[PDB]
Amino acid sequence: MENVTVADEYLQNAGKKEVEYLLSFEPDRLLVEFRAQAGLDTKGAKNYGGWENGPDESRNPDGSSKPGRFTGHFVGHWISAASQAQRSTFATADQKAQLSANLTAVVKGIREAQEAYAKKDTANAGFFPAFSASVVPNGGGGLIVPFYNLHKVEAGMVQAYDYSTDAETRETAKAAAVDFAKWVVNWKSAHASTDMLRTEYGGMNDALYQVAEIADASDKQTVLTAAHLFDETALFQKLANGQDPLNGLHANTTIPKLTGAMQRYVAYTEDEDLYNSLSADERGKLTSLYLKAAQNFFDIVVKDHTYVNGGNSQSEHFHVAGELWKDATQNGDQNGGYRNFSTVETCNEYNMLKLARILFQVTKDSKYSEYYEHTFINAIVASQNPETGMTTYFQPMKAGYPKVFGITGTDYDADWFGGAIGEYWCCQGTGIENFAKLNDSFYFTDENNVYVNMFWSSTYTDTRHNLTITQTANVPKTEDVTFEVSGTGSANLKLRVPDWAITNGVKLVVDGTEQALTKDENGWVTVAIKDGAKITYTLPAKLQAIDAADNKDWVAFQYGPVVLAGALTDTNYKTNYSYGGVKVRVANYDSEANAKAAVIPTSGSVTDWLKGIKEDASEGSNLVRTDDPNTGNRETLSFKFANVDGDAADLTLQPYYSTYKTTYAIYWDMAEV
Ligand SMILES: [Mg+2]
Ligand code: NA
Ligand code: NA
Ligand SMILES: [Zn+2]
């Protein structure tokens, strides 16, 4: 098991805020709806409200009756995140003791509700009673996407089994998760003619495959059957056959299904007894249907459906391949609803990162690491307000919007949000996981190989070996990454040659001698390491312009792995949003800010102006790096346009990921005088 301490100050703050937020939740309030539906004493507690409202006005903080709600979804994410925080290195010993006690109380409380519910309703024994079993699988009575909500609890239980230090808690989580899988099988055999894939079910196949790994031998086949009930093979077949069926599909609905296809692959290939239990046909389909569907999905998404920050979707859906400008700009800027601002739901990138991660673990292809790094910085890290810890729903791509974050719904950050009842969007629930597990994908151990997935100052150890690796990195503020190795034994360090680096300037020095950048068949350079190894890896950052396939005149700028944004106008977090959907905050457009994002070359064409951008961002470039590399931290990166007219001439471009106090431009409108 990896242990990774994080020395990067921006990521330390991000992770510490999340631990504080997780600690602000009370177990009895998380447990209210489970208890109520199971007939157990609720101790007069209220649920946390918003998407965690239930049907009953006396238990809902806002007093509403049968509101649109997603009961259990955020409780499930909280179990995941509080578990992840036990494994991660942001929480102190004392924070971990308290959060672990809280996790144990929630896991035991849900198990108790499950068991009490099973006696009230034997036919549905094993159901997690977050809401009425009568609305499975399509919802009803204001309860939306039941299987999606249950998926979070089931996924949560696996994380608690994996990461709780409390033996009873692990055993309780396993019993709960296996009993829920048995429920899925019993429910579906009783409702054999009911389609349970038409309504969003989250990553239920994924979670159940993960349950099969933890189940007792005599339960595995039952859990595998449950998992496979949630494999949408008709979708997978289309994808495997090289179709792009995505136009009109809900994006966050779809992505986790393919992570579940990959979990099937992993579950069967990593347990020889399971692998051997398949037919020859089934065995071949692991590769020809499941892996192939996921590989092809990932590729079509990144090539044809992805914005410069690694994100996808508009109004929560995929649209026409390549029509990114159209989706981001031709859907209105009026306040409220889901319009231009509704690009790049943040859940989608949490899911894309998990898909890239399991594709990496199976294939070792460096392209998945390049994507991971890019999207982790420019969509996930970018999603957080560094003062509050809260996270985004949408990420607008058209210029002139602010970033809008959620609220706590707890006494955390009361100086910002006062006594307001929380909302607990999906994006806030994936959000808490993003920051609880923030250090889980820096390095991957595989036999005596150690893959460097991202470049961050950190220290890596693993209980399976006796080497310690300390990385110091600041890219792209400074260009040298160093590694220092201590301990005993040997290993093979695997390094990516980033596409974002100026290729001819990349240099690898190992123990004071330059090494060639020879790649293995998966794209990795390999360095033998042992005690006292010292590596300097020079990665000069490339400045580049990235347009949309459907509009050469809508252009974002990126320096090394950091997408830049222009700071346009001041924003006020108290008034800069409206509502859309179910209690979702959506950004309000600033048309004066948008007007500043016109990039008008003083002389010549837009094409010639773009050609005059230099990769090294030096004097003479049409976009010039202005910060001193040797002063300030990474977020002090700063750029200015040159040879342009109007307001853009005076703007600062800085990292998108750290921009939150102003409206911003990621994509600029290139225009002739
Ligand atoms: Mg796992
Ligand atoms: Na083009
Ligand atoms: Na001001
Ligand atoms: Zn979401």
Numbering used by the authors: 379 to 1051
Article passage:
In the present study, we characterized a GH146 β-l-arabinofuranosidase, Bll3HypBA1 (BLLJ_1848), which was found to constitute a gene cluster with AGP-degrading enzymes. Bll3HypBA1 also exhibited < 1% degradative activity for Araf-β-pNP, Araf-β-OMe, Araf-β-Hyp glycosides, and β-AOSs containing Araf-β1,2-linkage compared with Araf-β1,3-ArafGal2 containing Araf-β1,3-linkage. These results showed that Bll3HypBA1 is a β-l-arabinofuranosidase specific for Araf-β1,3-Araf structures. The crystal structure of GH146 Bll3HypBA1 consists of three domains: catalytic (α/α)6 barrel (aa: 379–820), β-sandwich 1 (aa: 821–920), and β-sandwich 2 (aa: 921–1051). The Zn atom of Bll3HypBA1 is coordinated by Cys3-Glu residues, and GH127 and GH146 enzymes share this structural characteristic.
To obtain a clone suitable for X-ray crystallography and biochemical analysis, we constructed Bll3HypBA1-NΔ379CΔ761 and Bll3HypBA1-NΔ379CΔ933 without the LamG region. The crystal structure of Bll3HypBA1-NΔ379CΔ761 (aa: 380–1223) was determined at a resolution of 1.75 Å by the single-wavelength anomalous dispersion using a SeMet-derivative. The NΔ379CΔ761 structure contained one molecule per asymmetric unit, and residues M379–V1051 were modeled. In the active site of the NΔ379CΔ761 structure, a Zn atom coordinated by E723, C725, C804, and C805 was clearly observed, and a Tris molecule was bound to the l-arabinose-binding site (subsite − 1). A crystallographic anomalous scattering analysis was performed to identify the metal atom. A Bijvoet difference density map of the data collected at 1.280 Å wavelength revealed a prominent peak at the metal site, whereas a difference map of the data collected at 1.300 Å wavelength, which is above the absorption edge of Zn (1.2837 Å), showed a significant decrease in the anomalous scattering ability. This result confirmed that the metal ion bound at the active site is Zn2+. The three molecules, including one in NΔ379CΔ761 and two in NΔ379CΔ933, had almost identical main chain structures, as the root mean square deviation (RMSD) values for the Cα atoms between all chain pairs were less than 0.24 Å. The estimated molecular masses by gel filtration chromatography were 91 kDa and 76 kDa for Bll3HypBA1-NΔ379CΔ761 and Bll3HypBA1-NΔ379CΔ933, respectively, suggesting that both protein constructs are monomeric in solution (data not shown).
